[PDB]
Amino acid sequence: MNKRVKIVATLGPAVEIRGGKKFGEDGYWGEKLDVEASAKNIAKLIEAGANTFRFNFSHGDHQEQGERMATVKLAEKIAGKKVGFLLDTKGPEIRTELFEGEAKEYSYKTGEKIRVATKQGIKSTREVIALNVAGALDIYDDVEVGRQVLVDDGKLGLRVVAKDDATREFEVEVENDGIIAKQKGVNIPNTKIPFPALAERDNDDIRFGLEQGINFIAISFVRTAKDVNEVRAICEETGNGHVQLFAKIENQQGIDNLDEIIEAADGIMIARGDMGIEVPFEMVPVYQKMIIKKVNAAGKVVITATNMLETMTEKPRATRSEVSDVFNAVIDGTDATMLSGESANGKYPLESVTTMATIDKNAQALLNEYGRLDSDSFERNSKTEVMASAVKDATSSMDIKLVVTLTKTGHTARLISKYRPNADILALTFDELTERGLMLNWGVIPMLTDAPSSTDDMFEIAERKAVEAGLVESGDDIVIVAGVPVGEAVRTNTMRIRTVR
């Protein structure tokens, strides 16, 4: 049984060994990274079903990121299995500043009047909270009376009741009892702070990642196609045209502009952390189902992200709600499910990947009956689309163990994946960029091979590689799909039904 739903795991110190010490142990950080020991731990995550690692450039400098990418490349060799490399941008983050007097935090009561500063490069005081705004932008003219400033995963609400021109301060009322600590995330929902389409820091971070070697970029807080297009231009300028871009939908602007964002991007990450603060809490499931439906209809990749197994950061078992959440993301139609803190800085990273894999596997068993995606509704605008629809029908009518496609660019594999056939998809391709680039498509098992010389060669290759991989045995029926010749599926395509000898 192959896991069809792909897992993105975020990496961090949780899997990393430093001087024989594990994360949280006394004097962990006083020790150099043990690359081999760390690489062996990361390999266990690959074996447990991680299909792509997320390097979150919100935390850690370039040397820390570059070192973690080098450790994953060693982990691939150890696992004898390849994974995708995904860079997640910092983007236009607002954080609380450091306090004067090195205070760590203060407690506030409902009804207190305090201020939020807009001046940059300054410290907070108990009564005047300063912001670290991405690119040191001045936000005073961008936030209107009646707006909400939310601190620390949306837990503490501050209502803007007046603005002070003299100090460029928001006069706010504490809406609920709570704590403001230093370096915590801040959200100001329903505003249009003019963060640039691509900030210098993100530009630098992307260029560094492209230099190291990546497959994917998840662009934080995408509001318009322009946020995607400015990243696409750098990928193209640097000869990294292979890189796929996932727009993170994290706020009302991104939801409002979803259609143009899907058009410009290679897929969507449903960033439920910022989204669950930026829109009403009970709307998140509506937006989750709507986004999965539209990305699937576009033949693109959707990643369902954030707090999926949150309790497993601290505890060895998920909650019943967390199991339901992961399971329903699969039934919704998600290509991939993501771990963030659970794999990056929790006590149980391998157990979190194992629990996600188990839920994802149990849920794929119910897609034929309960799946919310509806491939019958899709218009077939090309022969490769009508062939993918045919592959689906053949897997519904016959007991088909496996679909095998030979694909130069991944195009046939993506279209077959779009239709969600009740079969695994072995995608044979001829370069490592296309191979790693398919690792987040539903059901796709990418495998590197030599390009075939003829057509009849191609059907033999397809059956031999499937047999060598242990996906099929003598007497199993497979569906083989290729362009004729390979790479030309837009002009001429073929589907064969083959009994394995």
Next chain:
Amino acid sequence: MNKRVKIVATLGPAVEIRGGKKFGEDGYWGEKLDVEASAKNIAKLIEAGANTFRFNFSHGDHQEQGERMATVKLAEKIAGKKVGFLLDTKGPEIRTELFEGEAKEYSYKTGEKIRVATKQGIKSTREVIALNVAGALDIYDDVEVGRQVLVDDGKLGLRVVAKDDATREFEVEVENDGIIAKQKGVNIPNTKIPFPALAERDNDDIRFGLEQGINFIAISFVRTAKDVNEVRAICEETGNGHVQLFAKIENQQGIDNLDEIIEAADGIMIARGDMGIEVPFEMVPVYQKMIIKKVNAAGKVVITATNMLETMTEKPRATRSEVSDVFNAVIDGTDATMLSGESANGKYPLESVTTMATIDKNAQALLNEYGRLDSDSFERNSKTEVMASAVKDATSSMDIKLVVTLTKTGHTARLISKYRPNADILALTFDELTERGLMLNWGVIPMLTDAPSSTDDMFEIAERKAVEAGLVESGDDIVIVAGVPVGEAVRTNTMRIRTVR
């Protein structure tokens, strides 16, 4: 635009020139057959859309039939297009005798009480009507009081009121005003006169046709599967196992046994002439629609026959009702529509074929919308069936100009035809028997090609043949289906969707 519904045209003297004379001219039967001039007239029928010629063994002698079949082979070279050869059996007949005084006929009025004699070899009087029963069978014990004796295309009814065992006569009541003329057809519905399953006459005709080279046999008055199986036995005995049998459904027992008869036969001919006498006149459309539905569900051939354009025997234009009848047979799902006296004996054989072809082409354009048949009900149980379903869906999703099947036996062409794709079906086969055997399947264009060589590309050959025949040109999309490799005895396993060069 190619006509998908097949036309069966009955041949007879209407197209035959004898020493420069036309049928009905003085001294016609005095001249010898002008074979070249007659073949030129038959070639015009082929060009106008005849796909199979019917040789009606109810009339003529074997020499006339063999000669006519040779005239057709010459016509095929003139038209550059082959047709199917169908033999229609005489079957069992009952005819009114000659009268004493050699009176031609008598007029009767409702309520008149008269007699029908069962004794063979006597003459009719006004008061006592004598019958010529096939085989001189004594039918006395087979017709009960309350049965109906019908005379002359069922235009005059005699009700059996009493039986006189002394004279073995039927005491009957004239039910309606009508004529009883000499040598007119008699029907006695809902009786089981023990006509043999295979009469000596039909044995002689069938074996003669088989020796000449026929593709189809239409068996008159099929009552049970035994009536089909006795003809199947002759085909098997003689090494003519490729010959297809169409059961003619003409009476109530045939309708009652329709399911077992379809299973035994290769197809049905809906014999509306006798059927319209043997069942209530207003029920024929019910049985026509029911038979077409059952035969399409069985994957077999149905022919709608008799009096489709009957007024064109004597007039240059059909009636509105005849146009409707032909049109609605197509909508009902018929493979083929038939001409009898209109092509065989009438003043306008060419015009009759042209009119039927025009009506059939106009109706096929409505099949996507108003089509009676529903391909969605078929069970995809085989490789060939799922592949035939794929073809249908490709043709429903894209503008497919042509479906090409490389078929040793014609099985794949028959399965694609059943699905009624919105495309012409080119069936490339490797022997003349298989090619002619496909001539009545809806939408199928049979074509003979050289058996594939080890180094032949079947797919390139398929496209090239379709281009040369003028069915497709550069930029058209076609579907090609084949059993790879080398069209062995390997089930169809491959579908290509191809933009034509």
Next chain:
Amino acid sequence: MNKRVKIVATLGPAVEIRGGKKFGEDGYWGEKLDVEASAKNIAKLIEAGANTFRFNFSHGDHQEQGERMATVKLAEKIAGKKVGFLLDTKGPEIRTELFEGEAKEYSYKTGEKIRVATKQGIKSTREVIALNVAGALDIYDDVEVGRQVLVDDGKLGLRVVAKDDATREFEVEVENDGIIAKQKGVNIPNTKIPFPALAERDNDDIRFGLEQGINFIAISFVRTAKDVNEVRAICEETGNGHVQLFAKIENQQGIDNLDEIIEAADGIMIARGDMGIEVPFEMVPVYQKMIIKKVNAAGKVVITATNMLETMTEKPRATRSEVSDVFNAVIDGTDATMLSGESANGKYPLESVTTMATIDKNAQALLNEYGRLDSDSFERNSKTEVMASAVKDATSSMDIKLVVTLTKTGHTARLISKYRPNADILALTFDELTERGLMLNWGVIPMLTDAPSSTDDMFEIAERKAVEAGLVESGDDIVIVAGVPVGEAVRTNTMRIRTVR
């Protein structure tokens, strides 16, 4: 077992006894009309299943028409059943004139060069054919060179090769062997001869019919909504605004403007006679099916007309093609089928109505399985639509014997009819004008009653009237529908399912 599909029978001399003579007996026309003997004949046509009588104003003076309608009014009292009264207009007919020297006809051969005169009031010669044009219109400028003049049901084609300004004659070439007899229909298709939207003759005829009392008008050669609108105006101005107009579609312009004609009209008459001459003969079935679908979708009345049982004009039994034509109009979804010459001018008027009834009743039994109409497509606008759809479902879900509606205007009967429930529709109504106005709606049995006093009253009346008509007995389930109060279903309507006690 109630006949759901309605019959229009055209009246004429065929049913009229004159001085004890039947039509076509010697000296028939020399005798005065026997009103008692003629009414007894017409009453038999009612018992047989005629629902409406067509008075064709193309033939007969007002005195002949008036005596006929008066015969019909007497007929109902003999029958004890009412029927509808339909007036059909001469409209813009062209005819061949009388020939000089009392010659009845001439035969022509293909290639012959002759002339057609445009001057009115003159007689034809063999070499110069003269036209009787409606309202004595000059057509010389309104038909161009290359146009076709067709004589006698479009049997003989004359091709216009030149126009002679000096004589205002067409030089025409005979296109095929044929006869030009006196006072035969002439058609000049794809022309725009400026016939008034209403002609004084048609104005006058309509006003006469209204004085006698007509339920419907059929308007010949309707080209646009304009031709319907002018007839509407007269019906209102005379206090006859209750009169339903059927537009006759007979030509390309009527088909091209069908949507606007359907909007203005209450219904459509498919005039297959002129239609089959004015458009391609073999395309009539396409237009028939198309028109019936569109008129059902608008909730209006469609009549399939002309040559449905044509051979029964001369013979006591229809052809197989005629039986198919009637049967398939019912499957197409027609509300009504029509007899013209067969009931007006034929030897077998009563047998023609009996035959059409038998076929119609047989075909209605197949509507569930084979009905071409699709009630599921209709957008349920009003609550009246959704009530109608609900009644349809109740009759699909359970064994409903009958649907009873209490309707002031008939509007609930019209929407229930539109949905073609698997049940007879008893429409209880409160005047004779509304009750006859429903006689061409599919499945509707009109019945006069006095208005209800209470709601409990309205439901007890529906059931009592039903048991009294013999339509239902004890144990039969019926659906009752109504406005509350009766006749306001537009705002507030009710459906009840009741077992008869």
Next chain:
Amino acid sequence: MNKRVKIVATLGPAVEIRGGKKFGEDGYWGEKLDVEASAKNIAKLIEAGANTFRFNFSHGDHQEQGERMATVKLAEKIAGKKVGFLLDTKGPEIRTELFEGEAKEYSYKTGEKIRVATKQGIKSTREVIALNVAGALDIYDDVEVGRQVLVDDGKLGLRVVAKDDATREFEVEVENDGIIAKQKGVNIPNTKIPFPALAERDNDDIRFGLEQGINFIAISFVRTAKDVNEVRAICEETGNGHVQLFAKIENQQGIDNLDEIIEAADGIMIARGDMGIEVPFEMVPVYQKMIIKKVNAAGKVVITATNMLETMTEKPRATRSEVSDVFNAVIDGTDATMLSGESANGKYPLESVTTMATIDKNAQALLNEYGRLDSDSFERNSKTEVMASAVKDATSSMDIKLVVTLTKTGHTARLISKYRPNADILALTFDELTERGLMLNWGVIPMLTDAPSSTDDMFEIAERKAVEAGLVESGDDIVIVAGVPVGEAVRTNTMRIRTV
């Protein structure tokens, strides 16, 4: 905008004021019950959308349960809204015993060898854990080597490696690091401990609850139809035949016999607490979805229960996963969602009801598009079924603000509810047992009225009440359904589509 998905809230000390002391105060149990102040707190739960109160007979004695039910009777009066009363049985619970020397708990490491005693009425030690088995059953012969004993919501596993015939103890290996505390839940999945169909303790609790007046019984650990029928016997014998029985499905036997249990019962409670310990944790969603589908198909009531907003027991905000969990239970086709510890003994009982109401309201808006249930599949074999199918189509075809049913038994409300019309369902009934008995059916607003005077009267009543309750105003389209002649207990056979 009315909440169609029903809410069951468990009642407990969290809403109850003792003297002036809230729950978790210093010497809270050191006071009497402030009944009026408690009833005013419960009234706030009714206002926020609690449709039924659950009285969990696992915790408390008859006196505590009795007083709580009486406080609820007061809250209804304060709220001006009635609610259902549901008794939840203790059932065949296994718990850990009190410890030697009043020890609260001990912590264990993987691989540790210890013993579980089957002997009843003894204290636990660190090395030998004793069990408080319902009915004091000796379970020794019912658990084979290789079975698993689980403690505290299945958090700590013990693997039976051997059986000591001399002491009737299990030799177990600690499977994972964890804590054994006193009086914690114990599960022994995939065993057939011969607990009776109905234990004397459950018999007694049910009879006491029947005495106080209840609408529903939730039967813990239902294995077979016998477990339901033996409770039905008592509701019948005592003249409490109005009481509806929810089988709680929370072990493999329940799942295996689900069809026969649905047949015997009035509805199902999906008890995901025990169910997630008794079956593979990551399989609970499969059984939830299957159970909801089978119970809607039977036109019965399904409650999705346990840990739906768990974190709100201690925090003011639910997690993203908990929002997703409640939302998808609605999408799955649940009639009702439940709160246990969140309403019964947490810090935020009112905010818990409010959050569930908000998610449930938002989810019902997506049932027309993403709804799991499929009503086209139901057999239309009756006049009532045909009428219910006709109501659903009216609400699909038209913007219908409300369906009003005049129902003596509620049968017509239940059938209409089965079809999940896109509209609220006002159920006008003539006694208080029918009224309260409808309060867990999807979309049904029950309301008491006098049996009507006539057909015109009945249709007039229906509109007036709906207008009074503020459900609809002038220009609104409603569907009214009734059986005429009116009041004669006629099967519904009339539909009216009416502009108000």
